[model samples]
Target chain A: PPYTVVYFPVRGRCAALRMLLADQGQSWKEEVVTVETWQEGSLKASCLYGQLPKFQDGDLTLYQSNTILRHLGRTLGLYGKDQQEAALVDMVNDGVEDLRCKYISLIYTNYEAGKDDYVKALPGQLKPFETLLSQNQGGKTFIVGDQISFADYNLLDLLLIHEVLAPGCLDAFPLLSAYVGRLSARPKLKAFLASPEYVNLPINGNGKQ
Target chain B: MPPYTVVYFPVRGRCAALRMLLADQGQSWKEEVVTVETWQEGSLKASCLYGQLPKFQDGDLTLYQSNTILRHLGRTLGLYGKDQQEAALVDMVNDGVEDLRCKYISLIYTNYEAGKDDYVKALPGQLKPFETLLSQNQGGKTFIVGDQISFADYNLLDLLLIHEVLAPGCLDAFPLLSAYVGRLSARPKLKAFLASPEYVNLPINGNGKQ
Candidate 1:
């Protein structure tokens, strides 16, 4: 097996990275774990530095999802051409983290479960995201222009994840929904997403399999 | 009045940007607000682009802290020189935020009167590598990573503020108290800090007279 990404079998939390790997055309092995095989969970080599899907890389491990994404963004040229571009990508990506955190805080602290708060917050949040993502691409192609950057993939995956996890979100925030839909329909993204590598990856649809 | 950073004014949460500014050559205003006059306690504006720290360009708009600092660090050659440097800087600096939050969470959940937990969980977190993370690299150069950022000068100031306002105790995990004082004493940044806008408020209401 090529370098393995050990995690629970399902799309628990590591699904986004798989999508990114597929998008970048990089090969990786996913070592799915189960309770029946608890020993493997402990002994299995993982890209996880912190024992969390929050952080997982190939053999070169790092902790924190943001760090992992930054690393990948740089390696795949998804961030930007230079340092400033990279930093900006980082800022925008961190903004998404903040956005995600706010949702978590609301859900856990106020117990706004069943995604009630998310449905309420999406329109306001997405208007800016829709505007930012479109503008970051300078209105031409993607979140960072011509070549699809990590930010573009990030937006797509996050929107998909959030909407799938929380119901009725993208409808009110139709610009974001439509934006994601538009990007998800990209030829390169669509084609690779349907290929064998992504055959069983998590998606609202089964990668069109 | 040089130029005030009109932040929430209450809760030490908003002092970060101005701290970065003042940590530099000098003169950055941190206009803080207390509970009664807070903009959001009983209102809106929650959907702001930058989540916190309304850093200003002199007085009007809400400049973001992270962007402001990141740009400032990049411009001043303080972001360790390259993307790797930038990433490392960000990782460590953001670690400060992490440390602050971990402690803050304990303050809220573990402590009875914010001290009832005996602060048992606080210091060990710092102990892991807080001081070791820098001691070797800190040789000779004035501060954290050898001098001059448009911003980072404020890190010490920020740390001082956090400790002063919150618990008023050193992170025992960081046993390098003397080392810290040695590094900070009479340094230009600290000197700039002693003279910054935030330090103007005096005990016994004393001022320029003393």
Candidate 2:
């Protein structure tokens, strides 16, 4: 494989990039780091920012989940056709990332108490994406443009995990509900989503969801 | 005039770096300041994509998210990097800076009374990577990732500046970062901007904390 991902056993930040690679018919290797391995501190110390989801594309090494996504998007032609569309793609991805951060915080720090409020506010959180979809080709096409970009994959992964966290969370947004169905049904993506490699891994670390 | 406009509250919070980017690059932009009264009226807040401030406009394209705006300006202004690999490195540097910034914001806004001491104690571990990055690149004489100035430099500079406010003498241990801050701050344009009212008049953060 030309690309490698070093992360925990959980799907956490790497899920969207994996989905992007699978859908794009790219092969990559996974270097799973167990919690035990991480606690040893040597590898953690070597990390640039002392975080996981470190990635390698041949000789190029990178960290930060979104940085990897953007890099892959740049190298794999998944960013956008032009600078304008690329900015829009970035806007969408950033919005998804903002919501994803809240979700992660709730799961890791305040899950037992914050789940209800988090779920209740999810629709308002999700409305921007739905609005983004609606404004572009009447929600029939991708999130930013006619072609699928990396933001779509990221937004898809976020929506999927949220659905798991709060069942029927997308029910309120018709476009988002349909958009998930449409993106999930992609041939390779559908297969990957069902495969043991994806299905068996927990959505988050700490065994919360 | 450039077709760039920044819409945010009158705090040097998130927009400080990008504003510095614009100033250092000698780009002129409009500041559509959002007063607390205006922000609370619900219409503008509701209209924002993420319900956050620092909504930016580059000509006709409206963008939210401070980093997105920085990346956009970096792309348009030739500040991203020279090549694909350099661009990735730039993103990596910016991400690291952003992680620390988030923690700083959380402490300032949510837990200043209780968490400040712990945050200050743990600050060195957070500051070392950046010093190491500078050491790797021409012994801290150049920008964060490369010889040429990238958008991340502005963001990192702003981060260092605000940290100095929160924890005075924080950079004394890290010579590379200390020199980096002084070096970047000396750029004539950035120096003037720092001294100007546009940058000086605003508080470091909202809520009267920092």
Candidate 3:
């Protein structure tokens, strides 16, 4: 395989890139690391950042999931039409990442006491993406530009996972709702998402969502 | 006036790395500091995309999110890296830096009273990745990635420096990181910039913790 993704069996942080590759019609391989193996200490000791989802593209290896996204965005010409659009794309992804960080904390660390408050503020947190969508082509097309960028996949994954986190989180925002439906309906992405490989795995490690 | 204008509170928090990079490259830029009154004036907050400080403007383009601004500068300054592979490594380092900085920010703003002890205890494990990164390259002598200076080095330097303020003697365990911070800060314009009142008077964060 030209591209190999080393992650646990769970979706975790790798879902967006997997969706991106599937949507882009790219073929890749998975080097799944079992938790039993990860806890053995050797792989964790070997990992530079002490995390999974390390990626390999031929001879060049990359860590950090967003780095892989941006790399794919750059090499695939999915960043944007120009430097300005690329920046906008980055801004969108950064916003998504911030909210996702909070979401992860809620799921893994603070779910007991933090769940209710987090759900309460969820709308305000999600509004920016809707606002972004509203400003761009009246939310009819991609997040940053006329064509699909890597941020679209990231944003879509965020919206999907948030829905799993808080049911109907996108209900109030028509643009975001329609946007999710549209992206989810893309042929290859829909097929890949529905396949047993993606469907059977839990969204996170803890079985919270 | 240079095309770049950085607007933030009178603090070194997120803008330190970019400022260091600009000063080191001998690039002239303007800084627009936001006072407590200005930040509270309610106009500038509305203008910000994410309702946060450290907004950046390059001519007509405006951006929020510190890492976004860093990557933009990296691209414009040709400091990202020499090639695609090296660029990915730079991004990896930068992402790691951002992860640690986020934890530090949380410690200052949210967990100062309660989580400080635990955070300080966990600091070495959090910082070890960077040390490991340094050990892989030229026996920890050069920049984080290639031999040439890149934006990741600037961000990592700020990360290391602010960490020392948070925990004195924090980098002593990793000799390479200590030397790296010392060497990077000693560069001509950056050394002067670090000593200048513009940097010294400001807090590391908006809060007075550091």
Candidate 4:
């Protein structure tokens, strides 16, 4: 395979990238590292930053899922339409990452105690994305430009996960609500999302969404 | 006048890397420092996108998130490494720096009294990877990725500098990181900026820890 993703069986960080590949009609392989596999000791120690979701593109190896997404975006020409748009894309993606990090922290560290507060404050955290969508074509278009960019894939996954975390979290923002429906309706994406490959996997390694 | 303006609290916090990049590259930018009283007033804080400080504006474009700011400056200033492969490495290095910085931030702000010992104990392994990266690149002589000074260098520099503040003599065990910090800090403009009141007088974080 030309591209290989070394990640846990969960969709934790790789969901967006996988969705991006599927949406773009690209082919890639996965190297699933189960809890048993991760605890095997040697593989974890060999990771550059000691984390999973490592990627391999032929001879070049990578870690950090966002970096891999950006690499794919760069190579696939899906970053943005231009430099300014690319920056906007980066801003949006970074915002997604910020929230995702917070979500992960809550899930892995203190889900039972922290879930309520996290859910309550989620709308305020998610409002900026709605505002971002409003700025571009009044939320009728994609996140950055008129076409699908890598950020849209990441943002889409973020919204999906947020829905699982807090049902109807997107209800307040009509634009974000519509955005989820529109993007998820993409034929291949819809199919990929509905398939067993996506449906059967846990969203995170510790059995949390 | 430069079309760039940085808005943040008096402390370095997230702005240090962008500031270092600008100073090292001889780019001029305006600083709009917010005092604690002003921040407490809540108007500016309310206006922020993600309700965070260290906001950046360039030519009518405003952005939050330190990494985005660094990347925007990197792309516009040609500090984003030479090619796609180099850029990926730069991002990898930057992401590593960010991970470590986040841990440091948590310790300083939330758990300093209780968690400092554990963090310091685990510091060597955390610092080792950067040294390993340096050792692979030009024998730890040049910057992080390639011959040029990419934005990752600025971020990594700020990470290392503040780390030294948190744990003095922390870099003593890592020769490459020590020399890298020294080499980057000695740049004429950066050297001057490092000693300037704007940088030295302020704390590393908002609550005045370091």
Candidate 5:
């Protein structure tokens, strides 16, 4: 295995990275972090730098999920291959994080803070993305290059995550809805995501919708 | 001008980048962002990557305050010259941000409801950087780098920003307090800051203290 995922448990914050590894077809071993072991061992020390979902492979260990995503995105050839496109990728990803923060705000803080639900911004967010995908594919295929890039998986994963959290959540962005459909249809992603290694996690059914 | 600041009226969030900019200097800006324009919310959409804060300009038009800081730190030598190390520098800065957010939550949300002094523990948080900064420089040297890097000014600016926002004030971790003191005692970083092109406006010499 090229990498091993160290998480306190399964399908928490750590699963996000696990999904990334699997979605990329990279070989990995999942070391389920135990409370006792983590509390008494090196994991505790590692957690101080950041929390779980730490990525380790070979001699290099990566922390911070976003940076991990950036690295993985670069590794998978699923992200932008160039600088400008990379910035665009950052723009979209940042917006995705912003929405995520907004969503969390709605969840933990106030329910009715922005938009009726957030579907309002969904289309607007999807617009630039669709435009990107459109340019990258001429609206006929994938997001960045000809094949899957990190953006594809990211967008797909975000859509799926939101869906599991809130179904029919993306009714507004037709292109994104279509985009997700295209992404999941890929043999590698579709097969991997559907397999027992992935779809069978605790977070799989936490339908916040 | 050795260091400069970009700010809006009353919106420190917008000025956060500028503070990072000044922090890069290893000393406070000649005039740090004090009271400024309430940061224009939607206006940032037009700028570099449509990012926020400090809107700092160097030889290149770098944007994203913290990213800019990391770059400046690396460029000037705060972070060892490597993308991975630069990423680590960013991680440190972002972790500082996380600590800051935790403090804000404690102060503005958690402690505020409990009616406790927020700046008390927050001071310790501010001082936490001594360990990080200590590695990057000599205790006696005025700047954060071997000679000088961009991180010193940026970090000092972080302290100054804390002083501006925090009611009781940011002072904790005696070592870090002493470091901040060490920063003030030197004139290299500050002298350049006053001359920086990005200079906004502020008190030059109010409390130069121990």
Candidate 6:
């Protein structure tokens, strides 16, 4: 394998990138760090920012989920057609990341108590992505340009998990609904998504949604 | 006049690093500051992609998200890095800075009174990785990632500066970071910008905490 992912068992932060690798027909090794292993404190102490989903590409080791995505985007030529489109690609990814952060906060800290308010505000949160999609080719193609970028995989993972949290959440926005269906139907991605390795894993560590 | 424009609130909040980048690079930009009352009116706010400020413009290209703008500037102005690996490392450093900034913003805006103590206590651990990063790269002599100065340097410098305001002498234990701040701040243009009323007068955050 040309790539290695060091993360916990849960889908957590690595899901989107894993989806990306699979969809792109790229093989990677998973260095699963169990809860017991993480509790030993050595590995945790070694991590730069004290977090998981540390990734390795050949000789280069990288931290930060989005950094890995962007690196892969750069190396794999999925960033965009030109500098301008690349910036737009980044804009879309940053928006996805902001919403993902809020989702993680809710899932980890305040799931039992804050779920209702989080869901209530989710539509407003999701509207930006729909608006982004609408602005580009009437929401028919990818998020930024016609080619699929790393952000598409991330946004796909975000929307999928949100649907689990709030069933039919994408129904409100026709563009997002169809975007999900369209991206998920990509043959390689569709197969990897349905496989047990991805399907059987929990969306989050806390066993919520 | 320079083609770049920054749209945000009066505070230096998220725009500090990019502004520093512009000044240090000897580039000029327009500051279309939004007042609290104007933001409350909802028209401009609604137009924002994520209902947040620090909206930036480069000629016909408009961008939201402070980091997005920073990276755009980094890319366009050749501040990202020298090559692919260096660029990845730059992104890594910037992401670490951003994680800390998010925590800082939370403390300043929501929990300054009650959460300040805990946040300050945990500050050293949060600050360690950066010190370690500096040690790894040319024994803390060069910029964060490589010999060349990337945009992360400016962002990290801003983070270290504000941490000094939040917890005075916080970098005393980390000699490398302390020197890094001093070194980056002394650049002629940045020195002037830091002293100018435009940078000095604005609050570090929107809320009056820091």
The 10-residue segment of model 3 chain B with minimum total lDDT is B44-53
lDDT of each: 0.50, 0.93, 0.90, 0.91, 0.51, 0.94
Candidate 2 yields a Cα-based lDDT of 0.93
Which has the higher TM-score value, candidate number 1 or candidate number 6? 6
The true-versus-predicted C-alpha distance at residue A208 of model 2, in Å, is: 1.0
Per-model TM values vs. the true structure:
0.67, 0.98, 0.96, 0.98, 0.65, 0.99
Q: What are the per-residue Cα lDDT tens digits for candidate 6 across B80-141?
A: 88999999999999999999999999999999999999999999999999999999999998
Give the candidate number with the greatest DockQ: 6
Residue-level lDDT of model 5, residues A60-109, one tens digit each, is 56665565666666556555555444544554565455455555555545
Comparing 1 with 3 on lDDT, the higher-scoring candidate is 3
lDDT of 2 by residue, A104-200 (tens): 9999999999998998898899999989989999899899888989999999999999888889988889999999999999999999999999999
Complex DockQ, candidate 5: 0.19
**How many residue pairs of model 3 clash at the backbone?**
0
Residue A92 displacement in candidate 4 (angstroms) = 0.9
Clashing pairs in 2: none
Candidate 4: tens digits of C-alpha lDDT, residues B26-135: 88899998888987898989899888887888988888889999988899999998999999999999999999999999998998999999999999999999999999
Candidate 3 lDDT, tens digit per residue, B113-163? 999899999999999988988999999898999888998999999999988
TM-score (C-alpha) between model 4 and the true structure: 0.98
Lowest summed lDDT over 10 consecutive residues: which window, candidate 4 chain B? Answer: B201-210
The predictions' CA RMSDs to the true structure, in order, are 7.0, 1.0, 1.6, 1.1, 6.8, 0.8
- Using lDDT as the measure, the top candidate is 6
* lDDT of model 2 at position A15: 99
lDDT of 3 by residue, A1-209 (tens): 39999999998799999999999999999999999999999988777788888898999888889999999988888989887898899899998898889889999998989999999999988888888999999999999889999999999999999898899999999999999999999999999999998999898999896
